[PDB]
């Protein structure tokens, strides 16, 4: 039976796992549902075949609650929606070494390439690897072929989590593609035709191993950082001015092959993510599935606009025939900044309010009010008083025939003062 780890990550920052999220895992077989706190390495569980569901009961301060993940365990494998689980990672994260071999020398034209990146395989050998982010820091310098590494000044030793390169789109900063799967194919085929191993046959006449590696790396950038393969535009671009014309031409051949319709011959590649977000993620040239186990990966959204707002409803009844102890009812529909219904709990000065598919219902009598709290920037409301029968209705002193009002793009606190009038 199947090993899984439940790991909580923050969208956009994978340098460590996101701790203190309250998580619940639910199934439907003979399996005991359980609650736990997301932690720095993952939650290890051994599971029988069946269908399970991970739910976030709530999130660390400053994060949205994520959508529940449903997955199925079958015959030692994990499936989700239907595909086979793409998240395969090592058990001790940020434990793999990668380094830039600071003492290796070989030029592009006039100047040492010096982007000689490697990750250490479990058995001690070194695989060639390539940067995925052209502006972040390279793997730590080693002066002795990867046996010792310069630490980072602030976070210390920089090590990496080894994952299967699937779903690599999210680590790109400025990619050309918009389809994740298309993107992945592009990447695997660049690697397919580029430099992978010491002493391999260089299909391209007159290039050194190092010049191919440079070509390969620039091709990756084409796709990951939208690098323009043009000698003019490259003059000052991370040392690629020193790239001669034929070496550049190969880089083009790699991009053009990858863009073509052939399936990738590579099924899978190692990928590495560093424990410092200013450093670059690395795409490997080899594939080592022995160490990788299934991860149920849930990604929490950083709360992007820390500013939140209040919305107050009031009821006042007037005229000689107005029932001051009638409960008037209000249907409230909220949509967020990006035009999406709110399926979440909401805080008030009284008891809390669950919103189901953008909606919720409250009531008030003459003199009662209710303040909603902590609604996002750019939110919009639609609010209706549902039982106005008999009463002339004004909202913020405006006659409102169908007892309904709306407002989009709200950048501050807002008030809806309903008047219910009934004269005899």
CA atoms of 173 and 286, how far apart (whole Å): 23
Same domain, 97 and 161: yes
Number of Cβ within a 10 Å radius of residue 267: 9
The CATH number that applies at residue 117 is 2.30.30.670
Q: How far is CA 252 from the centre of its chain?
A: 30
211 φ/ψ sector (left φ>0, alpha ψ -120 to 50, else beta): alpha
The domain total for the chain is 4
CB neighbour list of residue 123: distance below 8 Å, 6 or more residues apart = none
* Among the listed residues 16, 12, 33, 15, the one whose alpha carbon sits nearest the alpha carbon of residue 24: 33
**215: Cβ–Cβ under 8 A, 6 or more apart, which residues?**
194, 195, 207, 247, 248, 250, 251, 254
Nearest to 278 by CA among 142, 163, 131: 131
**Does one domain contain both 238 and 346?**
no
Using the 3D structure, point to which of 227, 258, 292 is the last residue of a domain.
292
Let me know whether 414 and 311 are in one domain. Answer: yes
Tokens representing residue 229 in the block? 């393969």
Residues in the chain: 424
Residue range of the domain that includes 146? 90-166+268-292
- Answer yes or no: do 424 and 331 share one domain: yes
CA dist 237 → 134, 217, 221, 228, 229 (Å): 9, 13, 11, 10, 10
Q: How far apart are CA 264 and CA 365, in angstroms?
A: 67
Tokens representing 181 are 């799967």
Measured distance CA(88)–CA(95) in Å, rounded: 15
- CATH number of domain containing 263: 1.10.150.480
User: Which tokens in the block code for residue 207?
Assistant: 């290039």
Tokens 């991970």 sit on residue: 54
- Look-up: residue for tokens 């909401």? 346
Distance between CA atoms of residues 316 and 368, nearest Å: 8
Q: Are 275 and 378 in contact (CB under 8 A)?
A: no
Closest-CA residue to 186 (of 198, 195, 177): 177
Last-in-domain residue among 304, 326, 355: 304
**CA atoms 340, 346, 349, 351: torsion sign:** positive
Measured CA to CA, the distance from residue 316 to residue 179 in angstroms comes to: 54
Pair 136, 282 in one domain: yes
**Within 13 Å of residue 228, how many CA atoms lie on the same side as its CB?**
7
Same domain, 147 and 288: yes
Which of 228, 222, 130, 234 lies closest to 177, judged by CA? 222
| 201 CB-contact burial (10 Å; exposed 0-12 / middle 13-18 / buried 19+) | exposed
Q: Are 299 and 10 in contact (CB under 8 A)?
A: yes
Name the strands in the sheet holding 77-80, side by side, starting at the edge strand that comes first in the sequence.
34-37, 22-26, 50-58, 69-74, 77-80, 83-84
For residue 33, give the nearest of 23, 19, 20 by alpha carbon. 23
CA distance 359 to 151: 52
Q: Are residues 348 and 211 in the same domain?
A: no
Residue given tokens 């918009």 in the structure block: 178
Q: Is residue 309 located within the same domain as residue 423? A: yes
Q: For residue 167, how far is the Cα from the chain centroid?
A: 10
Shared domain for 18 and 49, answered yes or no, is yes
Here the CATH number for the domain that contains residue 410 is 2.60.40.1140
Tell which phi-psi region holds residue 337, choosing left (phi > 0), alpha (psi between -120 and 50) or beta. alpha
217 closest CA partner among 134, 300, 126 = 134
Is 315 found in the same domain as 388?
yes
**Under 8 Å CB-to-CB from 324, ≥6 apart: which residues?**
317, 365, 366, 367
Reading the block at residue 173, the tokens are 């900063």
Both 325 and 408 in a single domain? yes
At how many Å resolution was this determined? Answer: 2.8
* Three-state helix/strand/coil letters over the chain: CEEEEEEEEECCECCCCCCCCEEEEECCCCCCCEEEECCCCCEEEEECCEEEEEEEEECCCCECCCCCEEEEEECCEEEECCEECCCEECCCCCCEEEEEECCCCCECCCCECCCCEEEECCCCCEEEEEECCCCCECCCEECCCCCCECCECCCECCEEEEEECCCCHHHCCCCCCCCHHHHHHHHHHHHHHCCCCCCCCCCCCCCCHHHHHHHHHHHHHHHHCCCCCCCCCCCCCCCHHHCCHHHHHHHHHHHHHHHCCCCCCCCCCEEEEECCCCECCEEECCCCHHHCEEEEEEEECECCCCCEEEEEEEEEEECCCCCCCCCEEEEEEEECCCCCECCEEEEECCCCEEEECCEEEEEECCCCEEEEEEEECCEEEEEEECCCCCCEEEECCEECCCCEEEEEEECCCEEEEEEEECCC
Kindly tell me the sign of the dihedral angle through the C-alpha atoms of 52, 169, 216, 260. Answer: positive
Identify the domain boundary among 280, 304, 328: 304
Q: What's the start-to-end Cα distance of the chain, in Å?
A: 76
Q: How far apart are CA 276 and CA 137, in angstroms?
A: 9
Cβ contact 335:405 at 8 Å: no
Q: Which residues contact 326 (CB under 8 A, 6 or more apart)?
A: 317, 365, 366
Tokens of 197: 């191993």
**Edge-to-edge strand ranges of the sheet holding 414-421:** 353-355, 344-348, 369-376, 308-318, 414-421, 392-395, 398-399
Which CATH number fits the domain that encloses residue 14?
2.60.40.10
Q: CB burial class (10 A; 0-12, 13-18, 19+) of residue 23?
A: buried
Contacts of 70 (CB under 8 A, 6+ apart): 51, 52, 53, 54, 80, 81
Residues 59 and 182 in one domain: no
Cβ-Cβ contacts under 8 Å for 377 (sequence gap 6 or more):
305, 307, 308, 309, 337, 410, 411
Torsion of CA 362, 368, 373, 378, to 10 degrees: 70
Yes or no: say if 77 and 2 are a contact pair by the CB < 8 Å rule: yes
Quote the CA–CA distance of 194 and 267 in Å, as a whole number: 16
Tokens read off for 390: 């008999």
């Amino acid at each position: 039976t199947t090993s899984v780890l439940i790991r909580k990550y923050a969208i956009g920052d994978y340098s460590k796992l996101l701790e203190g999220a309250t998580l619940q895992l639910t199934g439907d077989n003979v399996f005991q549902a359980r609650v736990f706190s997301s932690n720095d390495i993952g939650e290890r569980i051994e599971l029988s075949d069946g269908t399970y569901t991970l739910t976030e009961l709530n999130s660390p301060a400053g994060y949205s609650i994520a959508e529940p993940i449903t997955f199925k365990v079958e015959a030692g494998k994990v499936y989700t929606i239907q595909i086979e689980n793409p998240n395969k990672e090592i058990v001790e994260p940020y434990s793999v070494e990668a380094y830039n071999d600071f003492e290796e020398f070989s030029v592009l034209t006039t100047q040492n390439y010096a982007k000689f990146y490697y990750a250490k395989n479990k058995n001690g050998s070194s695989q060639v690897v390539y940067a995925f982010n052209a502006d972040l820091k390279s793997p730590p310098d080693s002066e002795d072929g990867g046996k010792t590494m310069t630490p980072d000044f602030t976070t210390g030793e920089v090590k990496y989590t080894h994952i299967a390169g699937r779903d690599l789109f999210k680590y790109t900063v400025k990619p050309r593609d918009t389809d994740p799967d298309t993107f992945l194919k592009h990447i695997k085929k660049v690697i397919e035709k580029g430099y992978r191993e010491k002493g391999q046959a260089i299909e391209y006449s007159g290039l050194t191993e190092t010049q191919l590696r440079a070509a390969t790396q620039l091709a990756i950038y084409y796709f990951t950082d939208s690098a323009e393969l043009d000698k003019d535009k490259l003059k000052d671009y991370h040392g690629f001015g020193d790239m001669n014309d034929s070496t550049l031409a190969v880089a083009k051949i790699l991009v053009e092959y990858a863009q073509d319709s052939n399936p990738p011959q590579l099924t899978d590649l190692d990928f590495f993510i560093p424990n410092n977000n200013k450093y670059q993620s690395l795409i490997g040239t080899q594939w080592h599935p022995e160490d990788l186990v299934d991860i149920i990966r849930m990604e929490d959204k950083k709360e992007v606009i820390p500013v939140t707002h209040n919305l107050t409803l009031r009821k006042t009844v007037t005229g000689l025939a107005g029932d001051r102890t009638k409960d008037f009812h209000f249907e409230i529909e909220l949509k967020n900044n990006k035009q999406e219904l709110l399926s979440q709990t909401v805080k008030t000065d009284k008891t809390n309010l669950e919103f189901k598919d953008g909606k919720a219902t409250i009531n008030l009598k003459h003199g009662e009010s209710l303040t909603l709290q902590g609604l996002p920037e750019g939110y919009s409301y639609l609010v209706k008083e549902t039982d106005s029968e008999g009463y002339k209705v004004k909202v913020n002193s405006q006659e409102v025939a169908n007892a309904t009002v709306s407002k989009t793009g709200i950048t501050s606190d807002e008030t809806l003062a309903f008047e219910n009038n009934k004269e005899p």
